[PDB]
From Swiss-Prot, chain A:
Transmembrane segments: none annotated. The chain holds residues 258 to 499 of 505 of the full protein. This is Sensor protein FixL. Keywords: ATP-binding, Heme, Iron, Kinase, Metal-binding, Nitrogen fixation, Nucleotide-binding, Phosphoprotein, Repeat, Transferase, Two-component regulatory system. One of its GO terms (molecular function) is metal ion binding. It comes from the Bacteria. It comes from Bradyrhizobium diazoefficiens (strain JCM 10833 / BCRC 13528 / IAM 13628 / NBRC 14792 / USDA 110).
UniProtKB/Swiss-Prot annotation, chain B:
This is Sensor protein FixL. It comes from the Bacteria. The modification Phosphohistidine is found at residue 157. Residues 154-365 form the Histidine kinase domain. Putative oxygen sensor; modulates the activity of FixJ, a transcriptional activator of nitrogen fixation fixK gene. FixL probably acts as a kinase that phosphorylates FixJ.
Amino acid sequence: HMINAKLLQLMVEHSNDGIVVAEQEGNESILIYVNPAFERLTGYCADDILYQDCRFLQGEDHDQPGRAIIREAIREGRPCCQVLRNYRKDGSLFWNELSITPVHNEADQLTYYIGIQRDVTEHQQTQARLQELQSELVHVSRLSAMGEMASALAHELNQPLAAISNYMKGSRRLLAGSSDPNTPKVESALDRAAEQALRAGQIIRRLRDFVARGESEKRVESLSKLIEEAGALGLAGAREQNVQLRFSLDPGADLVLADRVQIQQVLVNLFRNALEAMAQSQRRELVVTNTPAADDMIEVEVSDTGSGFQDDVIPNLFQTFFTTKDTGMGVGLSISRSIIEAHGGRMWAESNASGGATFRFTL
Amino acid sequence: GSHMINAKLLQLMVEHSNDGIVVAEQEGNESILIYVNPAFERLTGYCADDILYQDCRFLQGEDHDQPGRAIIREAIREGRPCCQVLRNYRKDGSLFWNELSITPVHNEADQLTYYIGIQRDVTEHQQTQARLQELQSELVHVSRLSAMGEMASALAHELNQPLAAISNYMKGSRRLLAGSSDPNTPKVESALDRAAEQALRAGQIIRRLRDFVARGESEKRVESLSKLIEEAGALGLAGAREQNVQLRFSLDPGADLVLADRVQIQQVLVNLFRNALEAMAQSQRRELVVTNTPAADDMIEVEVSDTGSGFQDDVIPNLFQTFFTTKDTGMGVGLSISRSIIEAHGGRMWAESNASGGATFRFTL
Ligand SMILES: Cc1cc2nc3c(=O)[nH]c(=O)nc-3n(C[C@H](O)[C@H](O)[C@H](O)COP(=O)(O)O)c2cc1C
Ligand SMILES: Cc1cc2nc3c(=O)[nH]c(=O)nc-3n(C[C@H](O)[C@H](O)[C@H](O)COP(=O)(O)O)c2cc1C
Ligand SMILES: Nc1ncnc2c1ncn2[C@@H]1O[C@H](COP(=O)(O)OP(=O)(O)OP(=O)(O)O)[C@@H](O)[C@H]1O
Ligand SMILES: Nc1ncnc2c1ncn2[C@@H]1O[C@H](COP(=O)(O)OP(=O)(O)OP(=O)(O)O)[C@@H](O)[C@H]1O
């Protein structure tokens, strides 16, 4: 061999990843060796748990498919890597990434197993949390798309329906002083037309209020937390695009009264727009900063080095459906501005000195 | 001074482990390999006799600049363990994903720093993670787009009848006023003409929005049902594992290729999977079956059955109408968009109750 066996055992004993060695006895794989790393990870003392099967790490959490795959791989005589939910001495849960390798010891005419085990609890937590944030943000983004669609369509349609109603009113005023035998039939037809216009407006508001229904809650929220959550969702691709991230956060100006999912979605949209504007940019730098502002408010600034704003673009940004992308919708900024203004702040934009875009809002 | 296993036995276990295990010796800024196991020779495609007593940075190669390198060196310098993931290349140049844990230990007797590295091939998991990360962004964009599109379509359909009634009323009123002698008749005719043109322009604005949002490639290509079912399951059936929901994909390779737009069928299936998982939230038996079969007109039928709360008696004929929902926070657009997409693709989408009290959806393509 290449190493003195004492050195190998020493390395195993002081390794940080849990290492155990077990002996096949019937339908039990009794532990015969554990290292102090495993004692730490499990909170169990070797003298207590030796020469038993490690199923008690599951405890009362019997039914998970990791158990089944591991058991059948053991019978089949094949290594297997899985993840399991294990409980420590004090009952606390952790996720355990486990590799079992079965080995046939010829000299003893026996089967042994070697198990390497890592604590993937923190990673599993953050991944599940991001899954939750992703699903909730998807639902809120489709909701806001529907809402701004209805609002813009209603506003654009308001003028023709009002013109029709006024025309019917004026025509009835003109025909009031008439003797033509058809005049009553005309009056009935025009009255029914006006009622149709009224019902069209009613249908507009019916759909508008059926989709835009939702709790307009406001709670104390940490800006650091929601900025990190929004970066986690929206700024995934920053590394591959070589985007420089800077979070300049102020702990004294960190708690605001807001609906966290709505500010999350405004920031996610800003981050996506900034990353897109810096796809062909030589300098790719994103700065997020919070500062105190007047009226006991807090101002958030997001600056990039992207393609920025053409001269006429800035005053159109917040209008619904204004877009510079061939496949863009132009609803993100309009919804964002309405959300910021509904929360008691004002959202607005400006060009920065680097040729990119800076967005600010207050809460 | 304890011994619970003969050290020879421990070496035997390490030698036959399936996870790569190496041991390295600190000699300056190079951590020379002094031990590798056959698992590592497999994973790396290198022979120990060739690579022994060298640093393993050559696994990165020309991929010099990665954050793993910075994290690892600072952890090595600091004398502290580290777990990372890296992109390494084998002997033949092929790439692989390597989950690597290094633990530095100071052995007093030799007065030296050694390292123990446990390493796994995490190639497939990283692949699936990147693939799901792309799909989620694509699904976000397309779901937002389809929501807006069906919103416009339904709003247009609901408004169409009143505006046509208004136009017909103006036409009939002009017919009545034709051949009249009241002096106000010309002014009334002008007003009614302008009202009719306003209704026309309202229809024009409706179609403006409908064609502005519904712009998009409606392409159709040959697609494997197994593949798109797996992508949709990866997105929609994430929580099936933890809810102990039994998933069954009964796919037939002879009836596997269809002509479809993959992103639209992806979003229909994602919605079906979410609906099926939701209907089995308060169900004790949670079983989801997907099945494909040949169908007439050179088509293929896909069935998705669950053991959920299913459909009340009057629910079935309302399912596909826009805005029909049984959820307090639901939108009721998923099934309407799905059916319009399937019919635009040449198939028929429909639903029925199954014998287990749940829901069965079928479509053809
Ligand atoms: C070497 C080795 C290490 C194991 N380590 C763990 C562990 O850390 N946590 C755990 O939950 N199960 C672990 N298992 C699996 C359990 O010991 C047990 O074999 C498995 O859950 C199947 O149990 P069953 O077939 O009796 O239901 C390990 C198995 C082996 C062979
Ligand atoms: C035990 C051990 C195993 C290692 N295995 C690998 C490996 O498989 N692949 C790899 O790219 N780097 C591996 N490294 C890290 C490299 O040896 C090196 O420390 C790292 O690339 C930093 O290189 P630098 O010192 O030039 O910055 C390992 C380090 C140790 C201590
Ligand atoms: N960094 C930026 N900040 C703000 N507005 C920007 C920025 N870069 C470009 N814009 C302009 O703002 C417009 C609207 O952006 P908004 O986020 O509202 O929607 P979008 O990104 O175009 O599309 P979608 O709503 O589908 O995300 C863009 O089309 C572009 O003209
Ligand atoms: N698993 C299910 N299978 C079939 N029909 C279901 C299921 N769950 C609920 N339904 C009924 O069918 C309707 C289909 O709704 P659809 O999937 O179109 O949207 P939603 O889930 O209500 O909301 P959203 O569109 O926002 O996702 C539900 O509103 C309900 O009436």
